[PDB]
Amino acid sequence: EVCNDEVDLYLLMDGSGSIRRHNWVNHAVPLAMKLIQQLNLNDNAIHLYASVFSNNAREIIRLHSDASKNKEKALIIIKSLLSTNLPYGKTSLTDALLQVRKHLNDRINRENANQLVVILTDGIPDSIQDSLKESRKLSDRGVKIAVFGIGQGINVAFNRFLVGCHPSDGKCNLYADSAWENVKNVIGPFMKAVCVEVEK
């Protein structure tokens, strides 16, 4: 499919109280599933890491595990989110980003694979400063960061600043946003744009 390269992909998904339960069930979780359908998870291709951030970041798919490089097993884990009490709590994007940085510091990532973080969010993180501090630390290590905004509660400027684009003007391939009802129609072209840019 799309996104067929050697990439360690870290999927950070918002599961905070800012999301209505209806949107979590009908849109957020199916979106995460459709995003993964756009990936070729395999031994020599994409390796998936996934977490959901609320008050803290919960790791649901370990990097380099079986579900990490198997799409079938990954969808099962993502689908199992519906059996939890999510969504709730604050929006700790920082903690999620901190986990990614710890993975790099421990050299868990593949030495020769591109490093990509993909953030699905519907609102602002609790700390603008700390999440921006972590994102720049990552991007200084060659980690590409992509943001997928959802709904009317997002901050467009912040999302684009987190990516590394101008907060307002110019085209930004590593950023896209969408209304809740339209998320599954946008994620495809978004991932396709993200892929091409990472390969550069």
- Find out whether the peptide bond into 125 is cis, omega within 30 degrees of 0: no
On whether the CB atoms of residues 128 and 158 are closer than 8 A, the answer is yes
Domain parsing of the chain, residue ranges: 1-200
In contact, 2 and 46? CB cutoff 8 Å: no
Residue 70's CB: how many other CB atoms inside 10 A? 15
CB 3 within 8 A of CB 191: yes
Q: What share of the chain is helix, strand, coil (3-state, %, to 5)?
A: 45, 20, 35
Task: Indicate the resolution in Å.
Answer: 2.2
Contact 91, 99 (CB under 8 A): no
50 contacts: CB under 8 Å, gap ≥ 6: 10, 11, 12, 13, 32, 59, 60, 61, 74, 77, 78
Domain range 1-200, CATH class: alpha beta
Q: Are 172 and 163 in contact (CB under 8 A)?
A: yes
Q: Rounded to whole angstroms, how far apart are CA atoms 134 and 35?
A: 24
Residue 32 · residue 19 · CB < 8 Å: no
Q: 30 near 184, Cβ under 8 Å? A: yes
Query: Which amino acid makes up residue 168?
Result: S
* 145: nearest Cα among 184, 170, 123, 117: 117
